[PDB]
Design an enzyme around this catalytic site. Sequence first.
Site: not given
Ligand code: NAP
Ligand code: FLF
Length: 315
Positions: A50, A79, A112, A212, A214, A266-267
């Site tokens: 990140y 991670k 990760h 994800s 949301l 959310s940002y």
């Molecule tokens: N392990 C992994 O490979 C992996 C992958 C993806 C994500 N993650 C982690 O999970 C976190 C969240 O997942 P994500 O990044 O995919 O986003 P998400 O939590 O699914 O959020 C998606 C969007 O929803 C919006 N949002 C948030 N609250 C809201 C509300 N109350 N009403 C309307 N819209 C709202 C945000 O936009 P705004 O900012 O404009 O509010 C955000 O861009 C990441 O930041 C990361 O820490 C990990």
């Molecule tokens: O972890 C995040 O938020 C992430 C952000 C941007 C791109 C990829 C991200 N995660 C991620 C990184 C590697 C593989 C996979 C997946 F397994 F879903 F494909 C998801």
Amino acid sequence: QCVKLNDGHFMPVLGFGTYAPPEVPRSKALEVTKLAIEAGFRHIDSAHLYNNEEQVGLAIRSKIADGSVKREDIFYTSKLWSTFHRPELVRPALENSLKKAQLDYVDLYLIHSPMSLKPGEELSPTDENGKVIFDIVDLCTTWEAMEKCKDAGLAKSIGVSNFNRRQLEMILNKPGLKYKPVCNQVECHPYFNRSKLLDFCKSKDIVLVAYSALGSQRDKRWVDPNSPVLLEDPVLCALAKKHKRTPALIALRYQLQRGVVVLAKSYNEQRIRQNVQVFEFQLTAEDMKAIDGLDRNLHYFNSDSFASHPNYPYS
Ligand SMILES: NC(=O)c1ccc[n+]([C@@H]2O[C@H](COP(=O)([O-])OP(=O)(O)OC[C@H]3O[C@@H](n4cnc5c(N)ncnc54)[C@H](OP(=O)(O)O)[C@@H]3O)[C@@H](O)[C@H]2O)c1
Ligand SMILES: O=C(O)c1ccccc1Nc1cccc(C(F)(F)F)c1
Ligand SMILES: O=C(O)c1ccccc1Nc1cccc(C(F)(F)F)c1
């Protein structure tokens, strides 16, 4: 508001997602992580990938210094990135993350992704076609290195991310396994609810952590713009109207009521404050059935760069 992990530590069931794409200024992560803590988030999710660990760490340290929280009240996750799966690279990667964040320990360190990449300077090393250069690493050896990091006190807990049932099983059956993964952080939302994986994790006392939740940030690099927008789903909309909440809140509450720890990025100050309202209301059995009916096997992260990898988790 916490769940007891299989190693005895506790994890807050609502976490703050810190990923923002490179076009967002790095300074924003500092500002919004402070806002998240102010709003009541105590679980903060980051990663080497990140490029924000300095900023997120600074936010945590600022809120400790001004008396808002103690370090013990914060659950911070980082991670191990996929270019560091070779066991000798694991502890150095964690030490780098700790140095960036200026913390003595992380509460949680995750693999990760199971999709090992070529060791080197690049986050995403490439051939000619834009497909990634993969690496072949026995992830059981990576896991042994993670276990050593827990024993050394660099991580209080260790777990995995983006593992499927089989990949998780391989770790669990490892001869001489010292620590089970405490969690598997995976894509999880009403369009991809992971019911069978959740049942498996529950059976092994592994927490499923939903990302994800949301509907993702819909980044053009990995997400089809045609994919349905989760927060515009008519069923979630109807439920939001019924309870006078929002679709986002319905999506988050759904996860908690299934025993899934949920992240929310959310940002935006208003939406950050909104998301903590997940604890203020409940969904009925009929509401939960309606949401369960939305499952359509839709992983937003859906790119050739993932799908071609030999350890790609999805079938
Ligand atoms: N392990 C992994 O490979 C992996 C992958 C993806 C994500 N993650 C982690 O999970 C976190 C969240 O997942 P994500 O990044 O995919 O986003 P998400 O939590 O699914 O959020 C998606 C969007 O929803 C919006 N949002 C948030 N609250 C809201 C509300 N109350 N009403 C309307 N819209 C709202 C945000 O936009 P705004 O900012 O404009 O509010 C955000 O861009 C990441 O930041 C990361 O820490 C990990
Ligand atoms: O972890 C995040 O938020 C992430 C952000 C941007 C791109 C990829 C991200 N995660 C991620 C990184 C590697 C593989 C996979 C997946 F397994 F879903 F494909 C998801
Ligand atoms: O407490 C767990 O073990 C739990 C695990 C995963 C998801 C939600 C969980 N608990 C939960 C769910 C809703 C409300 C509250 C609390 F009342 F503690 F806030 C706790």
